[PDB]
Every structure is written in structure tokens, then in C-alpha cells.
């Protein structure tokens, strides 16, 4: 069958591109994915990674995890109940999450049913030729042909996949994919990785762990969450520790064996050992290009295995494009979506547009959470002669009463001190992901620190800290910190 | 007894002006207030209304009230506990609020002592003359002089005070001032009025009420929260109703009598009756001008009662200025603070600056809460030929799992459709007050709807809805509402 566009991967970027090309530009569109609903064996499905085994289910589970703090914190505000009656029922959480994800799967199914000129094909997409996508029964390229799709234009949108280190006993470890389907909450769990997925899952497991349970997070480097603001990295480490999570930095698994009861015996490179019920590898995500048989058309990959693209998401092969995680740049749903829309506008609208990968607001649903947009100070300090840091850090009042005195809210604004242009805003504490969104709009408008401090506060809020900072806390001048 | 600046009222506006003048411009400042710490008899104290009987304690108590919803909502996420064991200990909440407020009172005392040329004077400020403030022992102008203060510049920052309607039995009623100190949570309470204070307290009382408890809010007109977005006014009404609060609109107390058991018998203008344990009046606040003896220097008041000011906070009398609620405009702490910082940056900094009273971000800590900035559409529609309204309204997914299906999140952007300039942003739902702050910055920068929709979303948030709206839901054209443009 013949299409203006064939999209391989019915994910965040793929669905934006396919729906826009079909509905805004009246193109005949095919979209391919390996599953119509969430979970084993392929985990991602119609809707993509974010819907099925990412942002959507993890956010619901972090919300679930937050109640452990709310229940404890309620006492300071005079709430009384039988503490010994408190149980975290993980089965209910997983069932609630499964229903939520399945409902989305179903609506996307209804979307393809009800959208003329937008067709879904179940199976494994690969490139036969530069204008033919083959859909097969399995990821094995010798598996049965279900469809052959003639395509003026081909979009690769297959996303990414957990990285598993080749160590002895890797087979006894899981990724985030399996973590979403654990039938019982682990009593002891090691999250391996200092990234958002490890930190977010440490918080989820810490809340739902059965009595006498323990969550350990391990990371090779000295400080979790590289890429984030350093003050926030130190504070979130402290605040995770304060809520009972063991942060093992400068530590990495060397091998895993099974103890006689089926629990996992972890040997760290340092020789240290840990007995846990689950080992969750969250050490990285790699672009999913193996299964695409890109050798058939000579699309240029990087040694990492990402599809190389120009700013307009164009591969080295005309009429073949790549968006989203497969391009190994910013692995965010809204970036994927933005690239998909920009690509379709460019190619089918002749409305040339490229995604801006700078000043993207993002979040970490840690407990407590992070919101951030733009440059951290160390980065700004290499690119600008004079950099100012405006910093407010303090346990908010509600958390003196709550008993969570460790919950320091951090707000930091990084500026080009030569003109006061805001380069970065970095938040830690309840609300941070919600606060940072409109900050993304501020940085698009080249907001200066004067634009923040001349804006009238909403009081009382954590956000008003951003509009209450008149004076630098310190500077970088030619890369040197000057207190 | 000689100062560059004398400030009457150690509140939100008064202390910002005082501290700035002293620390930024090495000026000599006197600040007068009636009380050094919170509560009876004068309620407001060092730190002002907001710190003592306003934003700060109210926010702590709304946070306390939110745990009723979190404890119920936790069950959808798998939290299990003995629901019959749950009790709301009001006395604990009030004791914790009292300690939090006292620490702020003490924090301000430290500020005055640890700051050269910044001195606190206890007692009642009034104007003797153009350049002299008298501190007396009481509000009676006949009481003893404690001090006579020489002032190169006088700042009036005495704030506002609850209005109590002059109805038979008003003496059985409380204001917000007494609400903060109730020894026991009322079983039945009538919050009177449709403004933020009535709404916030109806939420607080609703969460802490003992078993068989009932919170009634009455409002004299048809729809609470006049001046807020109409969609949000209707929605908050529904969501308060859904959480057990009874909303009596077009109803107003004509009198209150004590029943023999100490409870209050409310007779409405309509003839309806209601027995409650507390009647909290929250029908308005009025500027505190009486006690300053303004007649003594001829400071002009408004047809309403507020000190008349120009854009630089100047009265008709030179060297005499007025900021905050005494001006009877926007009664918000950060507005008072902004006016104070501008007055001082003007007069002592030689850097004239005027508070912008448009595009002010503000909140209602209703459950769930409002965050708003700029014009509601009815107001935009009279000022602008073509107004677009962008609206998103849905129960977020977590609240389909929580079981609070009624918690619809509302996001509205109001624009000038001729250039896309955002004129206002109106939010109802968890985190709205936190979301709206950086929207205030966007409005200062003349953000267009395209600046929002071209900004990449943070996912998943409620906030990202603001970056997801490309197509108007409807328009006003020369005041007329319509789905489509001609
Ligand atoms: C645990 C986790 C949490 C995350 N949390 C967030 C968050 O909170 N916010 C955020 O913005 N981002 C988050 N992300 C990142 C976000 O999920 C991704 O950036 C986004 O899904 C990438 O979208 P995409 O279009 O590149 O691909 P995806 O949405 O992953 O879609 C790719 C699709 O292609 C399919 N597929 C793969 N190979 C083939 C093939 N050969 N043939 C057919 N179909 C194929 C897959 O089944 C999948 O559905 C998270 C990721 C994970 C793993
Ligand atoms: C229940 C309630 C909730 C509120 N919630 C919020 C909120 O969430 N957000 C917000 O922004 N605003 C809120 N406000 C409003 C806010 O409190 C005021 O806008 C703000 O306090 C006004 O500041 P001001 O500087 O005008 O005066 P105030 O802060 O009221 O300070 C006035 C001071 O003057 C003193 N005083 C009065 N007369 C004399 C005299 N003759 N001599 C000496 N001292 C005198 C008083 O003791 C008082 O301390 C709330 C108000 C109340 C009542
Ligand atoms: C979860 C959430 C809310 C409830 C209702 N109870 C709240 C507290 C009341 N209470 C006050 C003082 C003594 C009891 C009674 C109603 C139950 C379970
Ligand atoms: Br490091
Ligand atoms: Mg179709
Ligand atoms: Mg002093």
C-alpha cells in the first residue's frame, strides 16, 4: 500500500508527526508499532515509551509515593490516625496505573479508527528500500512479512531502550520496563544509576517498601544527577538520605549472583556486597536502531547508534527523517513532539522550522522534585565573561511544622551579568515542576533578572522567591568563582 | 527623636520601606506599631496583618486543611489505614501556627536591634503636624505621649481592619482575627461573604470540623469571588460543594441571637434561619485612617475612606506618603512591599519608580486553589475590540485515580486577538498559585499566546496546559461573545 508518510514508532514524536501530517496537511499516513497496549513482552506500545513505561505511569507512581510524606507530615498540622494500621498497597497502585495506561492505549486505538488517512499497522517496521517500509511478525528480519508500505517520506521514531551493562548475572537484573510490572513491592532494592529514572524509582520503592525494607541507590560518580545544578544535586542527595534512602556514590555493580532463597547478591567493584530482592539498572538509554535494518538504505548512524540528523531532523537520505530519542539528543516527550511538528510543518507545509533544544523546561519527579530551564552556572561560566548567581535556600515554614525540616527549597537564577539576561533557573522543592513551566516562556522572551525582581510576588508561594532576588549571591568572572 | 523617615505600621509595606531606607541608603528610620507579637488584643503586630493574622497563618491552616483531601485521596494510590481512627486536632494546628508566627515576630525584633538607624517604637502613631508623629499609649488621642518623632518624611502604612455589618447581634460574630484563635473548631459555622477570606476559612473549617459538622458560606449576591474569572467562580463553587461546604448565594444575615446553649441563631434577610456555633464575618476590610488623626494635617481621603495617593504614593501633603491597604486599592502584601520599595528607591535612592497595579499575580488558597494574573475576559472585552479566550478544563488523571473526579483543572488565557498579547491568565487546581508567579513575569514582558504555545512543555504537569493552547475556544467582538470571528 502507498503512503505520503510512513512513521516507524507510534510514540510521542511519531504520533505528533503522523496526526499533524494527516489532519493539518491532508497526507495519507501509516504508523507502525509492535504492540497495541502496554507491558510485556515489548513494554512500549501504541502511545510510546512515555505513555506506556515512562512519564505517565511514573508520575502516577511518584504521586502514590508522595502520600508516605503527606501521611507523616499531616501530624504537625494536628492530623491523628492509627499509624500501625498504615499499609502501602503496591498491587492497588500497579492496578490503578495499568488501567490508566490501558485507557490511553484504547483512546489512541480509537484515534486511528476515527482519523481518515491515518492508519496503524501492528508489527516490526524496517527499511527494505528508501521508499519501502516492511512490517514483519518479529524483530528478526527473517520473520514473516505482514505489510510492505510504499512511502514518499519515512520518519524513524522508534525511541530508545534501557542500556544493560555486560556484567556476570545481568540476567538477574531488571530495567525501568520490568519495575512497572513488579507484582510485589521489593523489601530491598538497588537502583543503579544517578540519573532521573534511578532517583525517581528510588523514591517510588522507598514509599511502597514493606516493613523493615531498604532502598539503596548506587552511582559511579561522586554526586547524583550530573547535568543538574550542583547545589540541587547536593540538596536532593541530603533529602533522599533524610527520607531513608542509602545513596552509595563512587560505587558500581561488578556482578550479580542468586543467594539460596532467590534474593540477589550484588558485588560492587569496591568489593562491597549487598543482598537485595530487585536490582534495577537505570544507567542509560540507547537509541533503537538495530531492528530498523538501516544498512538497507545507508542512513548514517553515530558509533553510539543514534540516527544523525541536521537541525530539520533530516538524515543523509532524502525523504528519510528521524525525531525523538532515536536521535540521542534531549530525551524528553515534549522535545520529541516539538521535533515531529517542526518536521511535518517543514516537509509538508513548506513552513521551515527547527526545534530549539536550548531553554527547554524539564523536571525530575524526585521527592522532593526538581524543575529547571537553561544553563547551570558551570556551563554559563565557560560561555560568558561575567555570570551572576542569585540563590535563595531555606526550609519553608510549612516544613518546620510538618517535621520535614530537611526539605530546603532551593531557587537559583543564573544570568549574563553583562546585561542581566537569565541563562538558567533551577528549583528544588514541592511545586518546582509546575513553577518552571512559565519560566520557560520567560527565557524564550529573553527575560532579565530585573524582569523577575520587578514582577510582584504571589504570596505565600515558593515561586515568589524568584521575584525577590535583587542581589547576586556570587559571580563567575572568566570561569572563576568569586564569592 | 529626629528621623529622615517615620513609618506608622510595622507591616508588609512599612517594614520594606523602613529596612530599605536604612540598609540601602544609610537613612535614619522610626517604625511605630501597637503590638510586638501576634494576637489579642490588637491582632496585627510587628510584621503586620499578613504575618500575624493574614497570608502566613492562613496558608499554614489551609495546608493543614489539605490533609483531609490527601488522607482520603491516598486510598486510590493504594494507601490503607483505619479511616475510623482519623481525627483533626485543631488545637495542635493553632499551637503550631502560634509558634510559627511568634518566631516571625521575634525575627523582626532581631532585624530592628541588628540594624543601625532603624528603631521600633511601641504604641499608637498619629499626626501632630506635617513633620511630627506622636506615639501615644492608646488609640484614644487623649492618652499619654510615649514619644514625639521629628520626620523629614512620614509614611502611613497602617493597613486595614475587618468591617462588621451593623446588624442586631453582631457582637455574637467574629472576624478572621478571632478565627485564628478559636480554642475549639466549630461543628457548625457560617462564613459570611464571597471573597477570598470567607472561601479560604470555609475550606479550613470544613477540614477541622468535628463529626456531624457542617460549613455554610453565605454570599449576598448570586456567585462568589466577584472579580475572578467567571468559569473559575462557577467551578470553585462546585468543588467546594463537592467537598461538603453548603453555598447559600443571594442570602445575607439580618440578625444573630444567642441560643440558651451558646450557639448562634442566624436570621437571613430572606426569612431563613440557621443554627451555627460560629458566625465569621468576611464581607470587607476597611483602611485604618481614624486613629492617625489625619484632620490635624489635612491628608485627603477618598469617597471610600482610603488615603488618596498619586502614582508615587504621595498624599496632598508634601513629605507625607501612603502605601498598602490604607490606600484601599489592591489589598495584597506584595503590592504593599512593591509600593514601599518604590517609594524609598524614589525618594532616598533618587531613582523614581512607580508600582504597576496591572498584571499582578495573586491567588486564592481555596481547595483547590486559584492563581490569576491580569484581566478577566468581561473586563478585556470592554477595553479591546477583539478578545480571544483559550480554555482547557478537565479532571487531571491523578484525580480520576484519587476519587476526587470533581477537581477539574481550569486554564484560561485571555488575549488581545489583534496582536495576540496575553491580557490575563486564570487557573483553578492544585499548584495554580505556584504556576502563576512566572506568568506574572511573562505578562510584564508582553508575552503573546504564540510565546506560550511555542514554548516546550514540562511533562507531565498541569502547567504545560498553558503551552498547549493554539486555537481560541471563543471571542469577544466589540463586547459581544461569539464562538467564531466574522
Ligand atoms: C522511565 C522513564 C521516564 C520518563 N519520564 C519522562 C518524563 O517525566 N518527562 C519526559 O518528558 N520524558 C520522560 N521520559 C522520556 C520520554 O519517555 C521519551 O523521551 C519519549 O517517549 C521519546 O519519544 P519518541 O517519539 O522518541 O519515542 P517513544 O515514545 O519511545 O516511541 C517509540 C515507539 O517505537 C516503537 N518501536 C520501536 N522499534 C520499533 C520497530 N522497529 N517497529 C515498530 N515500532 C517500533 C516502540 O514500541 C515505541 O512505542 C521518560 C523515559 C523513561 C524510560
Ligand atoms: C485573613 C487574611 C488573609 C490574607 N491573605 C493574604 C494572602 O494570602 N496574600 C496576600 O498577598 N495578602 C493577603 N492578605 C492581605 C495582606 O495581609 C495585606 O494586604 C497586607 O498585610 C497589607 O500590608 P500593609 O503594609 O498595608 O499593612 P499591614 O501589613 O496590615 O500592617 C499594618 C500595621 O499597622 C499597625 N497599625 C495600625 N494602626 C496603627 C497606629 N495608629 N500606630 C501604629 N501601628 C498601627 C498594625 O498593628 C499593623 O501591624 C490577607 C489578609 C487577611 C486579613
Ligand atoms: C480520611 C479522610 C477524612 C475522614 C473524615 N473524618 C475527618 C476527621 C473528623 N474528625 C475530627 C475530629 C475527630 C474526627 C471525622 C471525619 C476519614 C478518613
Ligand atoms: Br560527580
Ligand atoms: Mg484511520
Ligand atoms: Mg536598630
Residue numbers in the entry:
A (entry chain B): 3 to 485
B (entry chain A): 3 to 488
What does the paper say about this structure?
Trypanothione reductase (TR) is a key factor in the redox homeostasis of trypanosomatid parasites, critical for survival in the hostile oxidative environment generated by the host to fight infection. In the case of the Trypanosomatidae, redox homeostasis relies on the dithiol trypanothione (TSH), a peculiar variant of glutathione (GSH) in which two GSH molecules are joined by the polyamine spermidine. TR is considered an attractive target for the development of new trypanocidal agents as it is essential for parasite survival but has no close homolog in humans.
Crystallographic fragment screening performed at the XChem facility allowed us to test 352 small compounds from the DSiP library, a collection specifically designed to ensure rapid and cheap follow-up synthesis. Data analysis, performed by the PanDDA algorithm, reported 480 interesting “events” clustered in 33 sites possibly associated to fragment binding. All datasets have a resolution higher than 2 Å and the modeled fragments show a good correlation with the electron density maps, as proven by the real-space correlation coefficient (RSCC). Indeed, the RSCC is around 0.9 for most hits and always in the range of 0.77–0.93.
